Write an enzyme that holds these catalytic residues in place. Structure first.
Site, PDB file in Angstrom:
ATOM      1  N   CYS A 130     -85.582 -63.430-103.450  1.00 30.58           N
ATOM      2  CA  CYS A 130     -86.348 -63.833-104.642  1.00 30.58           C
ATOM      3  C   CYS A 130     -85.450 -63.821-105.867  1.00 30.58           C
ATOM      4  CB  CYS A 130     -87.540 -62.915-104.844  1.00 30.58           C
ATOM      5  SG  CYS A 130     -87.072 -61.219-105.211  1.00 30.58           S
TER       6      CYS A 130
ATOM      7  N   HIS B   4     -89.318 -57.255-107.382  1.00 33.87           N
ATOM      8  CA  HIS B   4     -89.600 -58.623-107.008  1.00 33.87           C
ATOM      9  C   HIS B   4     -89.381 -59.512-108.224  1.00 33.87           C
ATOM     10  CE1 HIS B   4     -91.105 -61.686-104.504  1.00 33.87           C
ATOM     11  NE2 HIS B   4     -91.905 -62.126-105.482  1.00 33.87           N
TER      12      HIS B   4
END
Ligand SMILES: [Zn+2]
Lengths: 308, 79
Positions: free
Chosen positions: A12, A256
Site C-alpha cells: 500500500c 496502512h
C-alpha cells in the site's frame, strides 16, 4: 480513469504514492509520453509507463488493476524494498523519482530531466556570522520539502517555519571562515526556485531519547486547498492541492496507506483495490487527531501541490 | 584543514552542526547524528539535494561540501 491497485504484500506504501503521482497531471503526461516512445528494454520507468498506460486506457471508468510487473521490478532492483515488510511512502516516493531521473539522464547521455522539471526546486541557504556579519550563501536542490510539525497548526505555518531564521549558538555554533572560529550565526533557508509540483513531507515522528524509541505524531496539521509561495527574485506561484498520501495507524512501525486525490472538482479516496467518492468536508479527518493524540490516526503525510 | 562543518535539520526542525571529512561514509554521518540526537543509525534517513543518501557511499561521492544541510527524517511504515 478511477481504478484501484492490487496490494501485493504490504505494498500500500507503493500504491498510495502511485495514485498520488497518477493524479499529478504533468507527471502522468510525461509518463504516458514515455510509454508512447515504445522502449524495448525493461526497467522501473518502462514498468511505471506500462502501468499508467493500463490505467489510462481501461475500457471502463471504475475497476481494479494489478501493478504485478511494477512490484516485481521494484523488488528486483532495490534491496531496501526486496521484502514483504511494511515501508515508508516518502522513502518510496524519493527512490522512484531518483531512479526514473537516473534512467532519463542515462538516455540523454546515450542537464535537467522531465522529473526535475516537474518536482525540482532550489533553496538558498544563507548563514550570517553574527561576529563579523559575513553572509555565506549556498544553493541546494530538492524534489520535496520535509517540514517539521506542531500541534494545531497549518502546513502554511510549517512552510514559513522551514524558511524562518534560526540562531546557531552554543553547541551548534557556526565555523566562520572569516573569524576562523565557531561563532553565533543566523541560518535561513529560502526558496530560490519554486517547483512545478511542490511535494510536502510532514515529519510526523518524534524520537524519545529516554525511551530508546520513536513515536508517530498524530497532531492536527491543517492542509489548505490552495497555497501561495514566494521566490527570492516570477515572484510567486499559486498552487492547488491535488493529492494527499495518508498514513493510518497509531504508531510508526505498522499501518496502512491511502490516498485522496482531486479529480474534475471532486475528491476520491483510493485504498488499494477500493475507490470511493468522498465529500470535501471528509478530507478534514486527515488533518489529524484533536484529543487522545496517542490513538489510531489517519493523518496526512505527503501533500502534492500543483502550480497554477 | 581536513574537515568541514555541515548542518542537519533534525526532526523538530532544529539545526545541529556536524564536523565531517569528505571520506566519511553516510554510516559515519549517522553515527555522529546518533551522538547528538540518540537516534539509531538504522532508523535514520538523510535527504540531500533531493536524494536519500546511501550507506556505503561517502560525503565526497555526493559532493557534500561545507554548510550543506542534510534533512533528517524517520519512517511511518505501512502496508
Ligand atoms: Zn565571522
Amino acid at each position: 480513469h478511477y481504478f484501484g491497485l492490487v496490494n501485493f504484500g504490504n505494498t500500500c506504501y507503493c500504491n498510495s504514492v502511485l495514485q498520488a503521482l497518477y493524479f499529478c497531471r504533468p507527471f502522468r503526461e510525461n509518463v504516458l509520453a514515455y510509454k508512447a516512445q515504445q522502449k524495448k528494454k525493461e526497467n522501473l520507468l518502462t514498468c511505471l509507463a506500462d502501468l499508467f498506460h493500463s490505467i489510462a486506457t481501461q475500457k471502463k471508468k471504475v475497476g481494479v488493476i494489478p501493478p504485478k510487473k511494477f512490484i516485481s521490478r521494484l523488488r528486483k532492483e532495490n534491496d531496501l524494498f526486496d521484502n514483504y515488510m511494511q515501508q515508508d511512502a516518502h522513502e518510496f516516493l524519493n527512490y522512484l523519482l531518483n531512479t526514473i531521473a537516473d534512467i532519463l539522464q542515462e538516455e540523454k547521455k546515450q542537464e535537467l530531466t522531465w522529473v526535475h522539471e516537474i518536482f525540482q526546486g532550489t533553496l538558498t541557504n544563507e548563514t550570517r556570522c553574527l561576529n563579523c556579519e559575513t553572509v555565506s550563501s549556498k544553493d541546494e536542490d530538492f524534489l520535496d520539502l520535509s517540514v517539521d510539525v506542531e500541534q494545531n497548526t497549518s502546513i502554511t505555518h510549517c512552510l514559513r517555519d522551514f524558511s524562518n531564521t534560526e540562531t546557531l549558538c552554543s553547541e551548534q555554533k557556526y565555523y566562520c571562515e572569516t573569524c576562523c572560529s565557531k561563532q553565533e550565526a543566523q541560518k535561513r533557508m529560502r526558496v530560490k526556485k519554486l517547483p512545478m509540483i511542490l511535494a510536502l513531507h510532514l515529519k510526523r515522528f518524534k524520537y524519545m531519547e529516554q525511551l530508546h524509541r520513536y513515536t508517530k505524531l498524530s497532531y492536527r496539521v491543517v492542509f489548505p486547498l490552495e497555497l501561495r509561495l514566494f521566490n527570492t527574485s516570477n515572484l510567486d506561484r499559486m498552487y492547488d492541492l491535488v493529492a494527499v498520501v495518508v498514513h493510518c495507524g497509531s504508531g510508526p512501525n505498522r499501518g496502512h496507506y491511502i490516498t485522496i486525490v482531486k479529480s474534475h472538482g471532486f475528491w476520491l479516496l483510493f485504498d488499494d483495490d477500493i475507490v470511493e467518492k468522498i465529500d470535501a468536508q471528509a478530507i478534514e479527518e486527515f488533518y489529524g487527531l484533536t484529543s487522545d493524540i496517542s490513538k489510531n490516526s489517519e493523518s496526512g503525510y505527503i501533500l502534492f501541490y500543483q502550480s497554477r | 584543514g581536513s574537515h568541514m562543518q555541515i548542518f542537519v535539520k533534525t526532526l523538530t526542525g532544529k539545526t545541529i552542526t556536524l564536523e565531517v571529512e569528505p571520506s566519511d561514509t553516510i554510516e559515519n554521518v549517522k553515527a555522529k547524528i546518533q551522538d547528538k540526537e540518540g537516534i539509531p543509525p538504522d532508523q535514520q534517513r538523510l535527504i540531500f539535494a533531493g536524494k536519500q543518501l546511501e550507506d556505503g557511499r561517502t560525503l565526497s561521492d555526493y559532493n557534500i561540501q561545507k554548510e550543506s544541510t542534510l534533512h533528517l527524517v524517520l519512517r511511518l511504515r505501512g502496508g
